[PDB]
Design a protein around this ligand. Structure first.
Ligand SMILES: [Ca+2]
Length: 897
């Protein structure tokens, strides 16, 4: 398992040292190397295709000891031209002061350290065996210190004993250069080019290909795939488990994304925890071998847009995280890099009382240098509200909005999360989170407050996608299978389609500012953290706070009671002329004196925002569009006088959690309505139209998997539509009256299909844990709890020794020609030569799966050149007879020859 043991780590380091001395003698070069868990460990790849781990941190000995204690230090030292093993810096000997050569030349045998049944350290070499000192519980030091690049042409391995530095050539002679995409935004986001962050999640143990393929073709160009690395880790050591090898996951899945010509981001962090080391200086992105990842993904993937730091409110100042200040200083640098490559930095925030001093006000109010950079590169910076915590939704909404309106962030987004549902009690007597509830804030904030990014919804593995049982796909083979949850199809996909088809017009920043009129400026420097960084305690009271709900951290519900008033933005400073065009600017310092009196505030706000309806439904208007929803139990009503339609008014009676987008025209009304229950319950809505001078007509069509039936009634000059439905529908109503006092409708929203990435010309990758399979020994889809280390993405398979074993994958090529297939494999007990490769159902040869070193971290690379055709190709490995031993398969990599 991924925490390793002391013995395991020790013996991995000895095997590494043998390998380095072999490489030195044979003049092998280092092809790649990569720190993990902040350099607690490294994965190394040499130019013969051997890969292995090295540990800079050793796991403690069990027993809970807290002191640093003895462990055997097995090093190596040159004598008359030959390396021989050392033990605690004397020659390692067993019997007759006989020294032991590091290279036995026909073996990979190396000293093995162990602890015996008597509790004593041992070291063995072949059949020879030596008992050392009694082990004692505690912390250990490593024999290995660090690996570092020296120049840009050499790699040095440093040890902590008297073992000499081993220097190896850095392999350089790869393909010619693929120049990076720089300058302009790689993928503009705006009201016209909204984005959906759809997650490829470690918790789904994903095949990235199968998640991408779940997204409909019309949605895909507007999708950015968010490669999500769990920060689940071992408490004692901080070592990541669920996403054990984050860099490798992100790299594999980014390749698959680039191959599929879809836009992608990497999410390495929730809270303080991050798979990648934070920087403090820009220079590090090119000069610092511990943080290669950041420049690398931008440089090598034209579809890569940058890094998403989610839920930035928890987990700081951990032994294995950073301070929030360090995180911001990281962002200061990463924003510059993002800018160069035309990407985005995404941050998302959810609050509680203890995270006020690190919220989006604090972000700029406490960090002047960061604030400068954010303002300078606001187009590359995206701020998102997150619905994860139990309270403060309006507080956090207003502050995140504020960051964008004020000029610090270039876009604003929502990361909706089921976890916001109030624990124990829920809302409206609904203990369990109903998916339909989540449509309400998203539609509201997108259409009324100009969010251009939707993220999730969370939890990904309960609201978007799930792995099912493997499915039979014919020919003996079985296949891992992922499906969308029904709510994803009937809420989130269908909603985004309403943005694309121009029903849900997203307002521009300037449009939001002109509608909003008022901003709070957080200019308090005295009192506690909430006084200095949070919005006024009672800002929302008497406005859109529900009667049953509390202020600030007692605000448990994100359904607004009315839409008379816009979301009130709370900002630190107004950075540009657009920010400074706010009609009303209230300094928060003056809030206690005047505005803290709810009635005074309501009076002022009532003059700024006219009453445009009555009733208990939420209704909010922007141009000829309404967002109307029922956030309460029961069927609830509104009376809404038309502003564009030539009839008089409508009365609405809506079921609980029904949301609607209503477009008024002079002689027409459209209604997009949703209320999706996966369990298949129907809801009733009633719509009454007053003041039609002739009988109206209607048409309806249900959307996605919705059912709908609509009946009409014409009597007493009132047109009544009853709508019974589960899920989404579009209803058109042709109604007209004699009103002349009405506004005029604008031309239709522009929606522009976002252009595709530049075509990726790099190497493709396919994980063996994602292959179709039959008669394999074991499939490790979750590698952290198993004994093999140093794998790519989240797993590997033991293909095994059955004569009927076989794996298959669909791979692609840009054009016909010869490609090299690198097969990453273990064969620890014997050479496997009974396994044939088939390309497009034709045998092309038998890979040499030469016997690999016995260490649990060691993988090797077998190579085959094959002809691929343009487009989809079939790759298979098939046993022809029983294997001489187990074959492990991690991945294949394919590149043009
Ligand atoms: Ca793998």
């Amino acid at each position: 398992a991924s925490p390793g043991t002391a013995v395991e780590n020790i013996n991995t380091n000895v095997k590494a040292l043998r390998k380095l001395i072999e490489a030195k003698q044979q003049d092998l070069a280092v092809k790649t190397y990569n720190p993990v868990n902040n350099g607690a460990s490294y994965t190394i790849e040499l130019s013969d295709g051997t890969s292995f781990s090295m540990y800079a941190q050793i796991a403690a000995l069990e027993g809970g000891g807290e002191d640093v204690v003895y462990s055997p230090k097995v090093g190596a030292k040159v004598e008359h031209d030959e390396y021989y093993w050392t033990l605690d810096d004397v020659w390692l000997t067993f019997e007759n002061d006989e020294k032991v050569k590091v290279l036995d030349e026909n073996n990979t045998v190396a000293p093995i350290v162990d602890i015996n049944t008597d509790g004593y350290w041992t070291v063995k070499y072949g059949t020879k065996s030596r008992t050392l000192d009694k082990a004692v519980s505690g912390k250990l030091t490593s024999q290995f210190k660090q690996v570092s690049t020296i120049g840009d042409e050499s790699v040095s391995f440093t040890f902590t004993d008297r073992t000499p530095v081993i220097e190896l050539n850095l392999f350089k002679g790869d393909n010619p250069e693929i120049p990076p995409v720089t300058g302009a935004l790689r993928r503009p986001i705006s009201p016209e080019q909204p984005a959906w962050f759809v997650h490829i999640d470690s918790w789904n143990y994903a095949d990235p290909q199968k998640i991408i393929d779940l997204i409909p073709a019309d949605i895909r160009p507007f999708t950015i795939f968010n490669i999500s690395l769990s920060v689940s880790h071992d408490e004692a050591t901080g070592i990541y488990n669920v996403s054990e090898y984050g860099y490798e996951i992100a790299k594999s899945w980014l390749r698959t994304c680039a191959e599929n010509n879809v836009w992608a981001m990497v999410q390495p962090s929730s809270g303080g925890f991050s798979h990648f080391k934070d920087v403090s200086l820009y220079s590090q992105f090119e000069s610092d071998d511990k943080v290669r990842v950041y420049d690398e993904f931008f440089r090598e993937y034209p579809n890569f847009l940058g890094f998403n730091y989610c839920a930035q409110f928890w987990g700081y100042d951990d032994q294995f995280s950073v301070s929030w200040l360090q995180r911001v200083a990281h962002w200061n640098q990463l924003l510059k890099l993002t800018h160069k490559y035309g990407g985005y930095l995404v941050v998302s925030f959810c609050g509680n009382t203890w995270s006020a001093n690190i919220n989006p006000i604090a972000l700029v109010k406490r960090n002047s240098d960061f604030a400068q950079t954010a303002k300078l590169y606001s187009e590359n910076f995206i701020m998102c509200e997150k619905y994860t915590t139990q309270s403060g939704f309006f507080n956090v909404e207003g502050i995140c909005l504020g960051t964008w309106l004020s000029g610090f962030a270039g876009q604003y987004g929502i990361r909706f999360d089921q976890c916001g549902w109030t624990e124990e009690k829920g809302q409206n007597g609904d203990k369990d989170f109903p998916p339909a509830a989540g449509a309400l804030p998203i539609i509201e904030h997108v259409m009324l407050t100009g969010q251009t990014v939707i993220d999730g919804p969370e939890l990904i593995w309960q609201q978007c996608f799930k792995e099912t049982n493997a499915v039979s796909v014919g020919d003996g083979y079985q296949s891992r299978n992922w499906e969308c949850f029904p709510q994803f199809v009937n809420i989130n996909i269908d909603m985004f389609r309403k943005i694309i088809d121009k029903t849900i017009r997203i307002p521009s920043r300037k449009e939001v500012i002109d509608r909003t009129k008022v901003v709070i400026l957080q200019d308090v420097y005295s009192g506690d953290d909430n006084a200095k960084y949070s919005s006024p305690k009672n800002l929302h009271e008497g406005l859109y706070l529900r009667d049953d709900d509390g202020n600030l951290w007692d605000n448990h519900c994100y359904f607004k009671k009315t839409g008379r008033y816009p979301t009130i933005p709370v900002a630190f400073e107004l950075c540009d002329d657009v920010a400074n065009s706010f009609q009303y600017k209230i300094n928060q310092s003056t809030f206690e004196g005047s505005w803290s009196d709810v009635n005074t505030k309501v009076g002022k706000f009532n003059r700024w925002f006219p009453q445009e309806y009555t009733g208990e439904l939420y209704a909010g208007r922007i141009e000829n569009g309404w967002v109307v929803y029922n956030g309460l139990a029961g069927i609830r009503n509104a009376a809404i006088p038309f502003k564009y339609n030539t009839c008089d008014k409508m009365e609405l009676a809506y079921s609980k959690y029904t949301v609607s987008v209503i477009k008024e025209y002079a002689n027409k009304l459209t209604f997009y309505m949703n209320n999706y229950d996966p369990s298949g319950s129907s809801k009733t809505e009633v719509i009454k139209i007053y003041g039609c001078t002739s009988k109206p007509t209607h048409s309806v069509s249900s959307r996605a998997n919705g059912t709908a039936q609509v009946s009409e009634n014409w009597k007493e000059d009132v047109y009544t539509l009853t709508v019974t439905h589960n899920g989404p529908l579009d209803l058109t109503v042709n109604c007209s009256g004699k009103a002349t006092d009405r506004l005029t409708v604008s031309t239709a929203a522009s929606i522009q299909v976002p252009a595709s990435p530049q075509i990726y010309q790099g190497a493709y990758q396919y994980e063996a844990e994602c292959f179709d399979f039959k008669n394999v020994t074991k499939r490790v889809t979750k590698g952290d709890s198993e004994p093999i280390r140093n794998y790519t993405a989240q797993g590997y398979i033991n293909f095994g020794a059955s004569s009927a074993a076989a794996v298959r994958d669909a791979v692609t090529a840009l054009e016909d020609g010869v490609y090299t297939i690198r097969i990453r494999y273990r064969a620890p007990s014997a050479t496997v030569n009974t396994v044939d490769m088939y390309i497009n159902n034709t045998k092309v040869g038998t890979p040499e799966f030469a016997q690999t070193d016995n260490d649990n971290t060691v993988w090797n690379t077998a190579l085959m050149s094959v002809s691929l055709r343009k487009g989809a190709n079939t790759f298979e490995l098939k046993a022809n007879s029983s294997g001489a031993g187990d074959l492990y398969l991690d991945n294949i990599v394919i590149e043009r020859k």
